[PDB]
Fold this sequence. Notes:
Chain A is mostly helical and 98 residues long. Chain A has helices at residues 4-22, 24-33, 44-47, 69-91, and strands at residues 38-39, 42-43. Chain A has one domain. In chain A, strands 1-2 form a two-stranded antiparallel ribbon. In chain A, helix 1 crosses helix 4 (69-91). Chain B has 159 residues and is mostly helical. Chain B has one domain (1-159). A three-stranded antiparallel sheet of chain B has the order 1-2-3, with no helix packed on it. Chain D has 80 residues and is α+β, with helices and mostly antiparallel strands. Chain D has one domain. The longest helix of chain D has 5 residues, at 15-19. Chains in contact: A-F, B-C, B-E, B-G, C-F, D-E. At the B-G interface, helix 2 and helix 3 of B face loops of G. Bound molecules: ligand XAT, beta-carotene (BCR) and iron/sulfur cluster (2 copies). Chain E: Belongs to the PsaE family. Chain E: Stabilizes the interaction between PsaC and the PSI core, assists the docking of the ferredoxin to PSI and interacts with ferredoxin-NADP oxidoreductase.
Amino acid sequence: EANTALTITLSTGALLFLGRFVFLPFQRDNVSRQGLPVQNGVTHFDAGDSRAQEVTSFLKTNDPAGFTIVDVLAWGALGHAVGFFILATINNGYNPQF
Amino acid sequence: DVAGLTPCKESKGFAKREKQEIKKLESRLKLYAPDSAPALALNATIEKTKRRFAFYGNEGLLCGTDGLPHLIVDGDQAHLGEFVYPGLVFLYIAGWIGWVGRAYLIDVRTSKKPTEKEIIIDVPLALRIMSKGLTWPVAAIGELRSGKLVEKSANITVS
Amino acid sequence: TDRPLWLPGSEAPKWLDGSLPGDYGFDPLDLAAEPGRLNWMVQAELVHCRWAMLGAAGIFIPELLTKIGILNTPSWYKAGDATYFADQGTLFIVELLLMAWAESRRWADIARPGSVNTDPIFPNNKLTGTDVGYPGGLWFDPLGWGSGSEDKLKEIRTKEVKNGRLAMLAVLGAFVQANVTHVGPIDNLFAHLADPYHTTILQSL
Amino acid sequence: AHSVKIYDTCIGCTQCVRACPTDVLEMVPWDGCKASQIASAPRTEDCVGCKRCESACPTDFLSVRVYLGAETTRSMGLAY
Amino acid sequence: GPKRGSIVKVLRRESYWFNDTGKVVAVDQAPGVRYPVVVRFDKVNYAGVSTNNYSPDELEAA
Amino acid sequence: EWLPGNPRPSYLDGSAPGDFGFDPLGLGEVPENLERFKESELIHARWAMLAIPGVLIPEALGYGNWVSAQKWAATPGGQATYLGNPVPWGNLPIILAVEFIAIAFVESQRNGESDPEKRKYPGGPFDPLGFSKGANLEELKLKEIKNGRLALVAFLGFVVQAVAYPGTGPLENLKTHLADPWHNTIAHVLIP
Amino acid sequence: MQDVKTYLSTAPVLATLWFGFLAGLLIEINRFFPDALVLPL
Ligand SMILES: CC(/C=C/C=C(C)/C=C/[C@@]12O[C@]1(C)C[C@@H](O)CC2(C)C)=C\C=C\C=C(C)\C=C\C=C(C)\C=C\[C@@]12O[C@]1(C)C[C@@H](O)CC2(C)C
Ligand SMILES: CC1=C(/C=C/C(C)=C/C=C/C(C)=C/C=C/C=C(C)/C=C/C=C(C)/C=C/C2=C(C)CCCC2(C)C)C(C)(C)CCC1
Ligand code: SF4
Ligand code: SF4
């Protein structure tokens, strides 16, 4: 039996810490290099896709590191997923002797 | 043994097939005079069948459920004579014929009229080239390493 | 000054000019026609001659002395399957490593002549050979023979290559005779001596 | 309504004009070849598409080309 | 252009003898000739001819 | 220099530490590839050098075989026994999580380096004794790379000898070689 | 006689002679070594 609240909390905290402090420069410069989906040398919105205008009100940040709410969602989703993976693996009841 | 196949000598169905064939041949034989030519021919066929079955049984061939020999070609040391040895012999012979043909073509290419020698074969030159094909692997590796086997400037179409 | 040929009335191929020892103009299949191959084939023939001479002196002489009775060595074609102080596979691996070292050094000499003439550990040794395939020096030429004027080394090198060719043929014959007639070579010689017109290769085959 | 084009590799041997069964081609004075003449295709409305001109042209690749297009009662070769 | 008797390689891309050697026959020295060089080959093309006219910049010195 | 008299490749002049012109496959022809390969060789070699003492010392002191040392995992329970004493935090999930987080942070910190020389040889906080100040850098680098290559070969030998003789360690195989050398060798595996 | 030798060197005649010799050789081999399914050596 594994504690659900404790496991999810610890896993999500670990993933959020990794995203905020460890892998943040790598994510930032890799997304800077792969800038935007571009067709014929111009972005979709500038090519004329009105539905493809980037939302910036949903990307405003106040962290010194520029950490964004979408980043929160991504790292938290990874945290919930890893926590549930650990919970299911612990409660699986499958213990093969290797 | 391999893939659940039994040896031909141990197998039943191989012997059953031999018995059936011999019985059919003797049933045919029952219609002729003992000393006539058809009787001698049928007896020769019977002896040939017996010899063939004995050789197949004694050579070490695997046998299926239906009673017929099966071949193993995965490289097994106990069944090299089934595939690997005839394959090597064929590779030698085919390389010989191909190599001597290529050599004759190359030698004819520099002539007064190559097409005439292309339809009407220069028999002495052909015989010389053909006799020099015994050691074709050595010459082939020699030209492969010497850089005189492949070409680099060949005609191609609009890419 | 036309040297004798393998086939009287013929003419020697262009690449075989007559300078190499044991040159009888014999190359019907043009195996050394291209300029590069001749040196490689010369080295191969030298090493084959020497290995075959060793094999002949190790096959025929022990069998002869066993037939006389001075020694008691087993037959050559079954001496591999005996009991030794070491396992057969271990001996094979050990010889692969030692021969790897020796043959790598010989290869380095063949590719770049005069490049491995010196001892890698003690640089004061410096083998004193000049011709590829004839290393010379103290290790391989102790008594100092075979270091003389040109056309004088020709005779001794021809002697070596011809005895080696004879040894090669003898060893191949010993192999095939052992395979066919499951007896040692000396007993086969005695059989051909006693009944020459019946004990031949034809046999009852 | 086929289209016939002449390219500047022409040598003016006049074989295409002689081969044409409907008098589509003709020779025109030119500079750029030893014969100093080139082929022209003014009556392309009468071309049937037989490609005899292409068969008669000596050149690595053809100096006269026929591109099949819209079909007409003259192009279809109909006598009825 | 190349002198008579030269061996040249065809560089015209739609030519049948592309990357093949030729034999220069005659060069026209008139100022306005567009393909003055005449080259003869060994094998015939699909149409069955073995001679063509080429520009000096569609041939190689080898 | 790896083969006496052999010509040396153009890119491998002979200035880098442990450079003997050994490159039969021509994998270092691309310059950026060569720099990456230099750094990766250093990292693989340093890891092997730091590893193999932990392969030998436990077996010498017992209670360890570097393959049975991982045996407690992949077994229900047994999350204990570092040095004959149980580990209070020996559970597999916490061990895995701690190792992943710590090594990820350390390695990402390493990855944030611009100068290739500092990529290979950081210095500073990693040289408390200042060995890199005694004007013996070339010889020290040569010694490091030579011992590291030897350690890499030794660990490959460890792995292959574990494959060939399951349930045994390196020192046990050495004692087997010493017990009867001429009938206990690689011939028993290469030649069945 | 030179013309006869040239005619006998044409492709169809040489092919006929070569394939006849090859077929005869194979037929004789199968007469003396019949029913050969696997190579004994
Ligand atoms: C025959 C031979 C080669 C023959 C080649 C020929 C004819 C080539 C002829 C031609 O190419 C030419 C020249 C020119 C071409 O234009 C035409 C042809 C016609 C193609 C090599 C033998 C080579 C023979 C060799 C190398 C023999 C080595 C023997 C050894 C090592 C023996 C070891 C042991 O016998 C001991 C001592 C005792 C025990 O231990 C047991 C063992 C282990 C068996
Ligand atoms: C402000 C601030 C702060 C704080 C912070 C915080 C508190 C944060 C948090 C955060 C968080 C806390 C987040 C989270 C998130 C989460 C998420 C986002 C999730 C998701 C999930 C999912 C997506 C899931 C899925 C699934 C399902 C549904 C089922 C099963 C399977 C799975 C798992 C897959 C501090 C103090 C530092 C200071 C500074 C400022
Ligand atoms: S396709 Fe026929 S009709 Fe048309 S131009 Fe050519 S020859 Fe004349
Ligand atoms: S056939 Fe070709 S080269 Fe001749 S005139 Fe017509 S288009 Fe010109």
